[PDB]
Amino acid sequence: MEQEKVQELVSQMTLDEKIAQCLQLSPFLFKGTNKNAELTGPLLQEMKLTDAHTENAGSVLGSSSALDMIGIQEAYLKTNRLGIPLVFMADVIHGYKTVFPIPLALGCSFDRETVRVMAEVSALEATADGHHVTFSPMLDLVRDPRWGRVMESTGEDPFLNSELGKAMVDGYQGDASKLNENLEQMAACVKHFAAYGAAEAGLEYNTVNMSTRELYQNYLPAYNAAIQAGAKLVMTAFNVVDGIPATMNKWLNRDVLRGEMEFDGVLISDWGAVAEVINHGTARNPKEAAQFSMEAGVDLEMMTTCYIHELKGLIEEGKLSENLLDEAVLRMLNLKNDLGLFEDPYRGLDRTKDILTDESRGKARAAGVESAVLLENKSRLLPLAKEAKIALVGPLATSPDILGGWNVYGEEKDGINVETGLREVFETVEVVSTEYTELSEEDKVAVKAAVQNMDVVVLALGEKNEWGGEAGSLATIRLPEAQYQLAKFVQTLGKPVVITLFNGRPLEVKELAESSDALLELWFPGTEAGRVTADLLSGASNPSGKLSMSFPQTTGQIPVYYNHLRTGRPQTPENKGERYVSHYLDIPNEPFYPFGYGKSYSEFELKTSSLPKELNLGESLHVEVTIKNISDIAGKEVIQVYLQDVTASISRPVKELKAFEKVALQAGEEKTVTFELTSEAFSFYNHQLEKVQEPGLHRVFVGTSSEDVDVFEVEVGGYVL
Amino acid sequence: MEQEKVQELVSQMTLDEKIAQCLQLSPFLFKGTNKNAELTGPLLQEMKLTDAHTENAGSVLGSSSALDMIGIQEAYLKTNRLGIPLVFMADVIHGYKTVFPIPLALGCSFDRETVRVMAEVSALEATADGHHVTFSPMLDLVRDPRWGRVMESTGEDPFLNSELGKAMVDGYQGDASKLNENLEQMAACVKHFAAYGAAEAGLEYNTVNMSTRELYQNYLPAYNAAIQAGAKLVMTAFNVVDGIPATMNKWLNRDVLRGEMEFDGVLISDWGAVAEVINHGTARNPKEAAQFSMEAGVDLEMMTTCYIHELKGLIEEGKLSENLLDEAVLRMLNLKNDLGLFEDPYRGLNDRTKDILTDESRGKARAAGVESAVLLENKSRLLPLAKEAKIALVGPLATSPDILGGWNVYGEEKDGINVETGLREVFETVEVVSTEYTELSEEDKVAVKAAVQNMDVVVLALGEKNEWGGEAGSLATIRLPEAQYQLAKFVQTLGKPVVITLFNGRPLEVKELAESSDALLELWFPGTEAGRVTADLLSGASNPSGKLSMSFPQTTGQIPVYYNHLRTGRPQTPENKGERYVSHYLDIPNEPFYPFGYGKSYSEFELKTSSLPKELNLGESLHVEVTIKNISDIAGKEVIQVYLQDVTASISRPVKELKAFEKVALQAGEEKTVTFELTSEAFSFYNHQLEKVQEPGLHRVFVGTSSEDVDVFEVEVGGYVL
Numbered sequence A: 001m002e003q004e005k006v007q008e009l010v011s012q013m014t015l016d017e018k019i020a021q022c023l024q025l026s027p028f029l030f031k032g033t034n035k036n037a038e039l040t041g042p043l044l045q046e047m048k049l050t051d052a053h054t055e056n057a058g059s060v061l062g063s064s065s066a067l068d069m070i071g072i073q074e075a076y077l078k079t080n081r082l083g084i085p086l087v088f089m090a091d092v093i094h095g096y097k098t099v100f101p102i103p104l105a106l107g108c109s110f111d112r113e114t115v116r117v118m119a120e121v122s123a124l125e126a127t128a129d130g131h132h133v134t135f136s137p138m139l140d141l142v143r144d145p146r147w148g149r150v151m152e153s154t155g156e157d158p159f160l161n162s163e164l165g166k167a168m169v170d171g172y173q174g175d176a177s178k179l180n181e182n183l184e185q186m187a188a189c190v191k192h193f194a195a196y197g198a199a200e201a202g203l204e205y206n207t208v209n210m211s212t213r214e215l216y217q218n219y220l221p222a223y224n225a226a227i228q229a230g231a232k233l234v235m236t237a238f239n240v241v242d243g244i245p246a247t248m249n250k251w252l253n254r255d256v257l258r259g260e261m262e263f264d265g266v267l268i269s270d271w272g273a274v275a276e277v278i279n280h281g282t283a284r285n286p287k288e289a290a291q292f293s294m295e296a297g298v299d300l301e302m303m304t305t306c307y308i309h310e311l312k313g314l315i316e317e318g319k320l321s322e323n324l325l326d327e328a329v330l331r332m333l334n335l336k337n338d339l340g341l342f343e344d345p346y347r348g349l350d351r352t353k354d355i356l357t358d359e360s361r362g363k364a365r366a367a368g369v370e371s372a373v374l375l376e377n378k379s380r381l382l383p384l385a386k387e388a389k390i391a392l393v394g395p396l397a398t399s400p401d402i403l404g405g406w407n408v409y410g411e412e413k414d415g416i417n418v419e420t421g422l423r424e425v426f427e428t429v430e431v432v433s434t435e436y437t438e439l440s441e442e443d444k445v446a447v448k449a450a451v452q453n454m455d456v457v458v459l460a461l462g463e464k465n466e467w468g469g470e471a472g473s474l475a476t477i478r479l480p481e482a483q484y485q486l487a488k489f490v491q492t493l494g495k496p497v498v499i500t501l502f503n504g505r506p507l508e509v510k511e512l513a514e515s516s517d518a519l520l521e522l523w524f525p526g527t528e529a530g531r532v533t534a535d536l537l538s539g540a541s542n543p544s545g546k547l548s549m550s551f552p553q554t555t556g557q558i559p560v561y562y563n564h565l566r567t568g569r570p571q572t573p574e575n576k577g578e579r580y581v582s583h584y585l586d587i588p589n590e591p592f593y594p595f596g597y598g599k600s601y602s603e604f605e606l607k608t609s610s611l612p613k614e615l616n617l618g619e620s621l622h623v624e625v626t627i628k629n630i631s632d633i634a635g636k637e638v639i640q641v642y643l644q645d646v647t648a649s650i651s652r653p654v655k656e657l658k659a660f661e662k663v664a665l666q667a668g669e670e671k672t673v674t675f676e677l678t679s680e681a682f683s684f685y686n687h688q689l690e691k692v693q694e695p696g697l698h699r700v701f702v703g704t705s706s707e708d709v710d711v712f713e714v715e716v717g718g719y720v721l
Numbered sequence B: 001m002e003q004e005k006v007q008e009l010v011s012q013m014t015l016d017e018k019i020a021q022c023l024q025l026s027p028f029l030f031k032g033t034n035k036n037a038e039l040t041g042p043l044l045q046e047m048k049l050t051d052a053h054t055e056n057a058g059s060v061l062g063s064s065s066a067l068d069m070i071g072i073q074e075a076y077l078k079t080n081r082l083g084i085p086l087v088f089m090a091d092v093i094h095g096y097k098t099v100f101p102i103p104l105a106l107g108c109s110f111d112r113e114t115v116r117v118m119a120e121v122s123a124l125e126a127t128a129d130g131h132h133v134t135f136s137p138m139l140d141l142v143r144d145p146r147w148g149r150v151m152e153s154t155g156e157d158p159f160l161n162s163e164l165g166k167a168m169v170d171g172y173q174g175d176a177s178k179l180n181e182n183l184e185q186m187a188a189c190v191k192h193f194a195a196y197g198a199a200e201a202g203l204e205y206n207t208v209n210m211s212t213r214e215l216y217q218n219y220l221p222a223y224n225a226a227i228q229a230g231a232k233l234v235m236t237a238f239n240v241v242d243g244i245p246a247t248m249n250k251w252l253n254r255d256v257l258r259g260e261m262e263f264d265g266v267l268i269s270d271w272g273a274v275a276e277v278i279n280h281g282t283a284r285n286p287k288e289a290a291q292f293s294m295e296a297g298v299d300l301e302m303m304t305t306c307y308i309h310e311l312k313g314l315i316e317e318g319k320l321s322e323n324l325l326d327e328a329v330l331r332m333l334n335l336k337n338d339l340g341l342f343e344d345p346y347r348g349l350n351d352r353t354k355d356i357l358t359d360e361s362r363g364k365a366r367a368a369g370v371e372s373a374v375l376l377e378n379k380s381r382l383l384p385l386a387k388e389a390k391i392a393l394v395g396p397l398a399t400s401p402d403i404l405g406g407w408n409v410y411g412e413e414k415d416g417i418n419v420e421t422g423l424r425e426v427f428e429t430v431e432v433v434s435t436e437y438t439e440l441s442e443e444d445k446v447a448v449k450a451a452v453q454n455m456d457v458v459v460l461a462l463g464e465k466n467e468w469g470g471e472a473g474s475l476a477t478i479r480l481p482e483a484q485y486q487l488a489k490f491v492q493t494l495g496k497p498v499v500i501t502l503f504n505g506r507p508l509e510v511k512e513l514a515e516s517s518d519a520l521l522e523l524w525f526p527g528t529e530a531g532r533v534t535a536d537l538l539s540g541a542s543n544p545s546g547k548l549s550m551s552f553p554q555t556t557g558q559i560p561v562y563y564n565h566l567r568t569g570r571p572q573t574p575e576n577k578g579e580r581y582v583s584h585y586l587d588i589p590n591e592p593f594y595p596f597g598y599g600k601s602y603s604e605f606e607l608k609t610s611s612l613p614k615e616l617n618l619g620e621s622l623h624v625e626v627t628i629k630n631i632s633d634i635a636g637k638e639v640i641q642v643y644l645q646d647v648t649a650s651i652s653r654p655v656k657e658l659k660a661f662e663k664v665a666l667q668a669g670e671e672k673t674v675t676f677e678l679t680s681e682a683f684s685f686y687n688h689q690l691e692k693v694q695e696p697g698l699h700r701v702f703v704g705t706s707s708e709d710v711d712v713f714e715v716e717v718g719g720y721v722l
C-alpha cells in the first residue's frame, strides 16, 4: 500500500499495540499453529504472556511449514484489530530443504555466482514454505577455528566475505524494491552486528575486544557491503563491543549502523540478547534492559519480554520518549509493506512443486564440487579410474550426517551418503564403517580384510555437525583421536590412500596429510555430498576450491591468518635459525595450509600484463591477467590479486586480498581477465579514524594463493584524481 | 652538582655532542674495555661508528664487571671534552650474582617484602660490580603462557603487579631523591611501555591490539604505579600499540607517559626498537625512524644508529627542532646527576666485593624461594616427608644445574645448588637416577625401577630448560617434552608414593602430572639456592605458602584464561549446567586447572570477616577486617585475599578483581587480625569516554584464600561524595 497509509496505521495504534509489534515469538505461542500445540500453555505462562500480547505480536520465527504459517496468520488476522499481518522469519543459512555446502565451504568456492544460486534456490524454497525473512548472511570475520560458528562465516578475509556477502543478499532478495512483487524472493537479515567471531579463546558468547580502528579496518566491511547492497534487516550480536553488549550499544547501533552506514531498516535482537544484557551486567533488570535497547534502536525483541512488560511504564514516567517506539513500529510496518503483506498476508500462498526439485539438487551438487578443496594429491593418485577397486572405510563411509550445522529444515533421509554416492560410479566398493570416536580390534581386522582385496582406500573421516555451529566450541581443534589412529593404521596396509574429510572447521590435518597420498576437504557439502564426493574422486568434476581460512599447524598457533602484520623482527630467509626474530621454538610460523591454497587435476600458467611504475592518488590500477590451462584436463583456477602498503602511518598487513576470479579453462584454452583496484583498495583507516590514502609504495601480488604469486612494485603520489 | 651547572652543560655541548649523548652501546665498542676487545673492530665498522661517536656516547649497556666499567669510564673521561661521564646500565632482573626466583615466582610469593629484599640485594650487588641502572621491573600484564616472557612478569593481575612493581622500585632505589648518596641503591627502569605481553598467539614480538579503554583499565596500571613510586627510567616496547610501534608512538609516550603519568625521566628504546620501526612498516628509513622516535620523546637509542647518523641532517633541514634534542640531553644529564656521577663517576667503586654472593644474601634468596613456590597437590598428607624417608630422586631436574631461570645474565651456575645436593643435606638415604629432558630410554626405565624398588618415596624432578622461555622462547603448545609425562606415567606404576618437583618459567599443562602423582610442588626456577629451597619444603623445615599469580590452563586451547573475566550474556551456572546454549567448551571445563590465588599448605586456617557496613557513600573507603586462625599443629603462612565485583555498570565489569592481599604468618593455634582499606579508587573503573569514574550501585566483596575459596558480602554504594 502507500507510505501515507502506513504512516496512518502508526497513528491509529494503541500504546500496547505498538509495544507488541516490537515482540517476536515462536509459532507454538500463537493460536492456530499446527505443531507443538502441547507446549503452548506451559511456556505462555512462564513468559507471562496473554492473548493481547500474542494477538498483537510483531513477528514469528521458525514456522515449521507453509501450513503452520497459514493457520497462524489466518487465526491472527481474525482477532487483530487493524489487520497488521505477521512477518515470518527463519534460519535459512545454507539451504531450506535442498541443503547446500556450509557457508565456510561456500567461501572456499571463491565463486560469487555459486553463492547467489545458493541463496536464490534457498529463497525459492523458503518463500514456498511460507517464510518472509532469512537470518542470513552471517558476516562475522573469523580468525579462530575453535569457535563452532566459523562454519557460518565465509572465512578470515573481509574482502571475500564482503563480495560473497553481496552475492548472498542479491541471491535472496534480487531487486530489493520489488519484494512486494517477486514472491519467490525474501528479505535477507545481516548478522551478527558486530565482531562476534572474535570471541576470546573461541569460547562461545565470550568477550570480544579490539581497538575501534581495527573494528572498522577488518570487522565492519562485510556487514557494510551487504547493507549497502540493500539487505533489509540487521540482527544484533551476543558479545560486548568495547565493554558494551552490542544489543544495547548506542554508539554501534545509532551512530555507526543508522548513522554512518545509513541503515533505516529493522534491527532485530539475537535470541534473548535484550534480556541478556542483564547477565553481562550492564543492566540491572528487565526495565533497564528495555530502556537501553530501545535507546539503541533495537526494533524487534527476539523471544524475550523486556519490551512487552516494561515499555509502557518507561514511556509514562518519561524515562523513554514514545517517538523512539513510534519510529521502531514504523520500521516494522515498512518491512511488511516492502514484502507486500498489506496486499497479500500469505505472500503468494500451493508451492510444494518448487521444493526439493531435481534442478535444485543438481545445483547443490554443483555448489559442492565448486567448494571442496583438494589439499594433497601425491603422484597423481586422483582422479581414480572408474573400475578402481575401492575399500571405503571410516565413520563418514555410511553416516547420514553430511548436511552440516545450521540445517534447520533439510532432512537427512533426502541426503546421499558417501557409499551410495561412490557405488553409483565405481563398480567394485567394499565398505567397513567405523565409529566416530572409537577404533576397536574387530574394526582393524575388518579393515585389513577389505583393504587387501581392493586397490585403493577411500578413508572417510569427520566431525559430527553437533561438534560445531552455535555453542560448539572445541578448545582443541582435532578430530577424535581414534580417527588419527585409524589413518595411521590404514596407511600401514600397503595400499594408496585418499582421505575424504568432512567437517565444519579448520582442523589439525598434518597427521592426516602425512598418513595418506591424497586429502580432499569436502567440508559438509549438503544434500548431494555423496555424489559431490564421487564426481571429484572419479574426475567427473575437477577440484577447484581454495581455502578461505587458514589451517593451523597446531591449536596453539591460533590465531593464524594470511593478512598479518610484519612485526619489528620478522623472520626472513636470511635470518632463519637466529633466536631473536618472531618465531616459535616448536612449530613454523606458517599455517599448515594457507589462505587461497587449493589443488586441481589441471595445471595453469598465468602472466600479468605490464603495469605502470607510477600512479596518481585517487587513481585505479588496472591489472590484466592472462591464464592458460596447459594440461589435457578441463578445470578451474582462482586468480587472486593482493595489495600491500609497504609503509604507512599505521603498521599495514603484509598482504590483503583486493580482487579474485574463478576462471574456467578447457584443455589448451587461454583467457584474459582484468581487474580494477580502485583507490579505495589502496586506502585504510588511520589512527584518527579517517579513511585515507597516503602517497608511497605498494606491492601488487598476482597468483593462485596468498603464497604462489608474482610481485610487482608501484609508487603512488603526485596529485588526486 | 646544581641544576644550573647541568643547564649550562646543555648550552656548551656541540650539536654532534648532544646527539651522541643519545646513544647507548655495548661495553666492547669503547676504548678501555676489559673483555671482548676483539669484535670491537668489525662491529664499529658495521655500525659505521667513529671515535667522535664513541668518545661522546651517552651510556653503556651490559658491562661485564667493576673492572670493565672502571676501565671504560676512566678511558672515556680522559678524552671526553666537557667531562660528562657514562651512565652504565644492565639487566638485573631477579638478582645479579645471588640469583632469586624468577619474577613470575616472586608473584606467587604474594609478599611485598620478599620482592623489595630481592630488589635491595640485587642493587647492593650490582652497584658493587659497577652498574648504575637496572632494566627491571618488567610490568607487562600476561594472560598467555605461550609467551616466553611470562617469566619476567608477576602474572595476570594488574593490582598485584602494581604492588609488587612498587616493592621492586622501592628496593632497587630506596628514596630516589638521594641516589647521589645511597650508592648501594640504583636507578630502576620500568618496562615494556606498553602492553607487550598481549603478543598475539603468544608469538614473540607479535601484534598487540585492544581498545584504549582496555589499555587504561588493565595494561597501564602497573607501569603507572612504578612510575608514581618514582622509577627513574622507562623503556619502550617492541610491539605496536593500536597500529603504531610503541617506540615512535607520540600519543602513548608524549600524551600518556609524559603528559598523564607526568614522567620526566629518560625514555630508553628497547634493543633496536628505533631502527625496527622500519620493519613494522611505519618508517621508510633511518631518517624517518629517528625523526618519529625523537618526536615521540625517545631520549636514548639502544645499540642502533638512527639518531647518530640522521639527527644532524634533520635539524639542519628544519624537519626536526633542536629543542627536542636539548630537552632529551637534559634528562640524560639529570639522570647522571641524580646518580651522583659528576661528583663520583665510579659511584663509590672500595672493596665492594665483600658485598657479592654473601652468606646473608644467599639465605635471603633461599627464603624468597620458599615464599614463592606453590604446593598444587598433596594427597593423604604425603608432604612433608620425614627426614629418614628413603628417597628415589629421578628425572631431568634431579642433577641439572639449570635451576637459576631465564634472564640470568650474571649469575653463575657453578654457584648454584642442585636438587641432589639439596636433598642429600637433609635426608640420609637418597638414590639418584638422572634422565634426559627430551628422552626416556629403556635403559632409563630399568635404572628407575631399581632405584624406586629400594626406596620409600619418589621425588620426580621434571622441568623446562630456561632457554625454552624468556625472550623469543615462544611455545605454541605449553607442555613439557612428552618424554617427561611418559616418565611420570612410568614412575607411577612402581607402587610407591610420588612427589613431582616441577621447575619452569611458564604455566604448563599439568593435569597429567597431577594425576600421575600424590603431590605436586611448583618450584618455578628458584635461583642460586634452588636445591635447599626444594629440600626445606619437602622436609617441613619450610611450609609451602605460595599462591598462583597466573592461571594454569586445562589445555593450550583454553588460552587466554584468567580469573578476572567478564560474565558474557550466557554464563555457565550450577543451575544451567549441561545445557548446550551457554558459554562453554564441548571438550574441557570453563575453569582453568588451577586458578589465580590457588595454593596449598601443611597448615589449616579459618578466616572470619568482621561485620561490614550494608551501605557506603561515593568517595568513601571500605574497611574490611579479617581475623585468621591457624587451627593446626604446624606453623605456616596464608595469603588472605580481597576481591571486588561491580555487579552492574555502564561497561561490562570483571566478575572479580583483586583489590587487596596480605601474607599472614601464624604459629600453631595462633590468631591475628588484619584490616584492609579499599578506597573508592578500588570501586572505580574507566568508562567508554575514558574517564576514571565511580557509579552508585551494588558491589560484592569477596574475602578468602584464593579467587575461588571466598565468602561473599554485598555493599550498596550511593548518596553523596566524600
Ligand SMILES: O=C1O[C@H](CO)[C@@H](O)[C@H](O)[C@H]1O
Pocket (backbone or CB within 6 Å): A091, A135, A191, A270, A271, A470
Ligand atoms: O541463537 C541464535 O538464534 C537465532 C534464531 O534461530 C539465529 O538466527 C542466530 O544466528 C543465533 O545466534
Ligand SMILES: O=C1O[C@H](CO)[C@@H](O)[C@H](O)[C@H]1O
Pocket (backbone or CB within 6 Å): A404, A405, A406, A407, A408, A465, A466, A468, A469, A470
Ligand atoms: O539450532 C541449531 O540447529 C542446528 C541443527 O542442524 C545446529 O547445527 C545449530 O548449530 C543450532 O544453532
Ligand SMILES: O=C1O[C@H](CO)[C@@H](O)[C@H](O)[C@H]1O
Pocket (backbone or CB within 6 Å): A211, A687, A688, B212, B241, B242, B244, B249, B250, B251, B252
Ligand atoms: O589508539 C589510539 O591511536 C592514536 C594514535 O596513536 C591516538 O591519537 C588515539 O588517541 C589513541 O586512542
Ligand SMILES: O=C1O[C@H](CO)[C@@H](O)[C@H](O)[C@H]1O
Pocket (backbone or CB within 6 Å): B091, B135, B191, B270, B271, B471
Ligand atoms: O631485547 C631486549 O634487550 C634489552 C637489553 O638487555 C632488555 O632489557 C629487554 O627487556 C629486551 O627486550
Ligand SMILES: O=C1O[C@H](CO)[C@@H](O)[C@H](O)[C@H]1O
Pocket (backbone or CB within 6 Å): A212, A241, A242, A244, A249, A250, A251, A252, B211, B688, B689
Ligand atoms: O569503541 C568505542 O566505544 C564507545 C562506547 O560505545 C564509543 O562511544 C566510542 O565512539 C568508541 O571509541
Ligand SMILES: [Mg+2]
Pocket (backbone or CB within 6 Å): A645, A646, A647, A648, A694, A695, A696, A697
Ligand atoms: Mg604507504
Ligand SMILES: [Mg+2]
Pocket (backbone or CB within 6 Å): B646, B647, B648, B649, B650, B695, B696, B697, B698
Ligand atoms: Mg555498578
